[PDB]
Amino acid sequence: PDVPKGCEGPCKVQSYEQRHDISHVGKVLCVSDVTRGNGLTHRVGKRFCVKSVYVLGKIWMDENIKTKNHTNTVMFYLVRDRRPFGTAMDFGQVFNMYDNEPSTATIKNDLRDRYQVLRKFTSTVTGGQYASKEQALVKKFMKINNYVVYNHQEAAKYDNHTENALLLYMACTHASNPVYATLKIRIYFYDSVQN
Amino acid sequence: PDVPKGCEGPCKVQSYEQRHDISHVGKVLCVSDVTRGNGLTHRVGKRFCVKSVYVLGKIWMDENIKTKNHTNTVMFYLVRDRRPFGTAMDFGQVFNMYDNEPSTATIKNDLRDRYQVLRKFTSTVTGGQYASKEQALVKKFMKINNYVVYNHQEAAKYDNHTENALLLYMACTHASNPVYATLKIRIYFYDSVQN
Amino acid sequence: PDVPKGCEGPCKVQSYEQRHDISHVGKVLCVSDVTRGNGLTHRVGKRFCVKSVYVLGKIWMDENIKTKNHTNTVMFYLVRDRRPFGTAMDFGQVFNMYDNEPSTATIKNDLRDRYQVLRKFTSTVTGGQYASKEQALVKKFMKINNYVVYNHQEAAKYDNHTENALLLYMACTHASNPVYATLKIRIYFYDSVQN
Amino acid sequence: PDVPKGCEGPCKVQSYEQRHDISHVGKVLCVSDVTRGNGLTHRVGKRFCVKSVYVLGKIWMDENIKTKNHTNTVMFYLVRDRRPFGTAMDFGQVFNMYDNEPSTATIKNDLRDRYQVLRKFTSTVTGGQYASKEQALVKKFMKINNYVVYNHQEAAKYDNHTENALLLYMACTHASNPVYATLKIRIYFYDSVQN
Amino acid sequence: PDVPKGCEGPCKVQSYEQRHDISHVGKVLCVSDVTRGNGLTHRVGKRFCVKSVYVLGKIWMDENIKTKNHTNTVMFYLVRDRRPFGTAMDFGQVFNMYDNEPSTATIKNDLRDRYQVLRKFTSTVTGGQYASKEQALVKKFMKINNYVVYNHQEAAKYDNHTENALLLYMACTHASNPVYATLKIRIYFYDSVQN
Amino acid sequence: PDVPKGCEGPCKVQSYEQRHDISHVGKVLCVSDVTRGNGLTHRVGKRFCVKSVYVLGKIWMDENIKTKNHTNTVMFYLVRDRRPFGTAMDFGQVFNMYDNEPSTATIKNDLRDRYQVLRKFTSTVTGGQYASKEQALVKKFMKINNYVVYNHQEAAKYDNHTENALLLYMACTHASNPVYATLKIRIYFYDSVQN
DNA sequence: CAACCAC
DNA sequence: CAACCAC
DNA sequence: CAACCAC
DNA sequence: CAACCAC
DNA sequence: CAACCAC
DNA sequence: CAACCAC
DNA sequence: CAACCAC
DNA sequence: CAACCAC
DNA sequence: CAACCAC
């Protein structure tokens, strides 16, 4: 039961260790960016299956910001988009929402067929002068059998793939002040035998 | 399994993206206000079936209000009236309650046959000078097999209704200060074949 | 047996009566174009199923061209793109081939996933000073259950298409002279019930 | 068992409330006149099935006429005509009869294949100086599963349909003086899925 | 096995030996014409069943025409109209087509219900100065159980026809020159027992 | 059903888009040539299975050649040699034949064991001053499970081949003039698991 | 069978 | 269980 | 699962 | 489900 | 069906 | 399948 | 099979 | 039952 | 059903 259908070989990892600075406008990153090559943690051919994503790390408030009394959450929309073209679209223009508000957000009407939300998961942080909740921990494993397809070329970029691009979209709920998110996004995949 | 009884065609959506300023008196809006027309997100006949309501968004406090130390829950009441007539009745004259208190709110004895509460749900928010819970995220998917009927005229209003009509009543529990609720109310409906 | 799966209603028709002047470079047209409306020969919803395409007409030479001793054939590639964006792509840039020769034509290696060749069918014409053959008849019915989607907006254009979309690509085999093609491309479809 | 075969959707009504002034020569009206459009009580496509006709109202004598001692009946021939062309033919020239007499009337020999009588129903009124029967009531429901076909255009006119036109033919039995008939003819129909 | 349903008697024949000079505009003839009478090759009743049509003969060029380097084909559309009225309609006004091109010909959208194409069968001829092909043979048997009706009167004319009626429509593909067609159109029928 | 026995992975493609100028002597090319590498369209191991060959393109005359009254045909012998050594052998020395006539061609008696003719398929062209036929289309798909081996080294050459190896041999039937052949020879293979 | 229309 | 690693 | 959209 | 009311 | 790519 | 030779 | 006519 | 509306 | 005509 370990390896999925249409794909074979050892379960290959790929990590995206990064400190993401989050805003109200919303940040994006492509989680299914795999370079091609003979090396370990590379894809072999143009086709592979991402079995599971493991998001883990911490969301936290800056030292000058944490004094100010407020609350903010981040949403973590893991969305698959079929038909990925050019640059990855911004959070604001993919998601329909009232007054640029991430809590009210759903996929736009025109491109609802294109993009689908696989997971969303709120993580909340509260500021305070005398008593803050500076940080909150993220530990979300998620099994999502997602088959992707690349071009003839290889550079682990959003442009280079042409099917089921997996995108992580983040957005801070509070409008004024930002928050940081130190995250390891770890994607687990297998190389496809099909085609 | 997808389409309800006596219904046809694609699952049409209708959205009510809005910032509602809530009070102790209570605010109302009809969630079934949909126009008749050939286009998408329009009804075709006078009858149609609402399958599910997806309320999602945020409830939040203003900057001058959040300093003042208090708590308030917003009560969301989803009611169906079997009989609409004229404009929609205010929260005070539908629900009976001690001293206009929405936590004690149930339907009046006279019009208990008329109005029925399908779902109710709360959302707490706490203000504070040095440490606050400024906001709370409302997310609520509610499935209800509700058949609604309209007049011959087609303008998407509570006046044009007949038989059932889905009303959302929102009320702040605290007396003096108000709160905002930035909400997307999304109704999912199908066009009817019956009569 | 008549209507396909997930679609309903009367078999609606659409036609493209037009004289297409062909070159070696390659002409294109989108056969799945159909505007939205309450009237006949219009899609109701954004989704619809094309069940069958009926190409019929004539491919013919001009009076000054036919006198010259040569032969030319037209290929007629009916292709479906699962990802339409903006303007319909040119023949030369979709099909890779030696020296832009349409008889040596297959889909490019990059976008082999996007474009699929549903049908090809040649039609041949021979021009000579005395021993001539001015014209040739085309009569090709071809059945394909093909579910195309549109944007929210209503206009018969390849821009507005989404998910599946049909494209007829025509290209003359001989380099240094053209041929005309008077063709009724007819298309038979049904309105979708799904989503 | 409600909706007939080959047709679907809500049962749509169409009414013809009118005061028909009847003569010996005979009056006609097309009962299956349905305009096409998105609106309520419109047809959707060119094809629909009339399930049932409900004729109701009153036949009555004028104030100066009712003094004169006589009797007259009206026949109410509900006839389907296949092959409707141009204007609707007059009662006198469709029906063969002795000396322009409606009581002796049957369909003409040439166009017996074209026209068929679905219903006839006599309604009788008697005049008198000192004691009249001024009026008589009509209440005739009639179930007649009749599939009709329209042109590409739409205006709810006899010319605009090309199959199974339903015509009501009235004719006063007494030669000299006329009678009035205030009638609601109400036709019940469903939109066709076939073709 | 021989005689069709609802008809009886000896298989009566009828023939139309005639040189039909063809154009680009389109020539027509009614093959179901047969006068009423006690003699042979006459219908007895107003109804009769045409069981089969046997078209045979030659399609040929003139001596001055054949010298010119060109090609032309004739279409031979055998159609049944279920509603005959007056004179037989012209080819151009029944079949819609781009620039009156008979190879791009199908029945008009308005009267698609009235006219049905039972058979089409092309016949091709190539004219040249030396490398010529003056003529081409036509030999097409085609079986169709077809119940036609007449008026009360007795004359082999399309005027007098009613219910089904057969029409052969002929049209030359090339525009600027004619072709001759010496054709025996033969038709085999039986007298109806029904009605 | 898709992948052959003893081989695995995605169906890798290889192409040979080239204008082959043909003579009476006989041109050759090795269609099984494929270099070793981690990239796409490369064999991984020394062994691999060619499942199918798709020849498509055009065979055509030059402008000065076509005017002369003659005919020529090309044979297209697809042969497998089970013993490749060095450079690919010439057409004349493999096939024995009277006066180097390629239509009278079969494998020599000495090396009948080595070479086997898998497919032959003619393509004919006729040149004339006025009554010409400049070109002819080739479209030949042909499926053969064919396990080829290589040397230790990595280069797409017949030298490096071992065990089975494919060779396309082309030869013009007419002696005193050439013909061009613009051909995409495409080949579909899978990497071997055995040994 | 022809090409959404009919026996 | 934790997260391609192992009992 | 998240929310009429796809796998 | 929310609470004697309806679907 | 066309030609490793898809319903 | 091509044409006594092979998978 | 040819084309209402026959073995 | 009355007439596309509902028990 | 209304009356040789059609569904």
Numbering used by the authors:
A (entry chain B), B (entry chain F), C (entry chain A), D (entry chain B), E (entry chain A), F (entry chain A): 63 to 257
The authors write:
Whereas nanoviruses have T = 1 icosahedral capsids of ~18 nm in diameter (although no detailed structures are available), geminiviruses are formed from two such isometric particles, or ‘hemicapsids’, fused to form a geminate particle (18 × 30 nm) which gives the virus family its name. Here we present the cryo-EM structure of AYVV at 3.3 Å resolution. The structure shows that the capsid is built from three distinct conformations of a single CP, and that these conformational differences facilitate the formation of the interface between hemicapsids. The body of the CP is similar to that of STNV and many other viruses, consisting of a jelly-roll fold with two twisted, 4-stranded β-sheets.
Structure refinement with D5 symmetry, yielded a density map at 3.3 Å resolution, and an atomic model for the CP layer was built and refined, starting from a homology model of the STNV CP. The capsid is composed of 110 copies of the CP, and we built and refined a complete D5 asymmetric unit of 11 unique chains (chains A-K). Each hemicapsid is formed from a T = 1 particle from which a penton of CP subunits is missing. The different conformations needed to build a geminivirus arise through differences in the N-terminal domain of the CP, rather than in its core fold. The biggest change is in subunit H, where an extra 23 residues are resolved as a helix-loop-helix motif (first ordered residue: 40). By contrast in chain I, an extra 8 residues (first ordered residue: 55) become ordered, but in an extended conformation that is different to that seen for the same residues in chain H. The helix-loop-helix motif from chain H is a major component of the equatorial interface, making a series of H-bonding interactions to a patch of predominantly polar residues in the body of the CP subunit across the interface (residues 214 & 215 in chain I), which is surrounded by van der Waals interactions. The ordered segment from chain I extends across to stabilize the base of the helix-loop-helix motif in an adjacent H subunit, presumably stabilizing the ring of equatorial subunits. The map was of sufficient quality to build 7 nucleotides into the density beneath each subunit, except for subunit H at the interface where there are 6. More significantly, a new interaction occurs between the backbone of nucleotide 5 and R41, at the extreme N-terminus of the helix-loop-helix motif in chain H. This motif forms the equatorial interface, and presumably the interaction with DNA stabilizes this structural element.
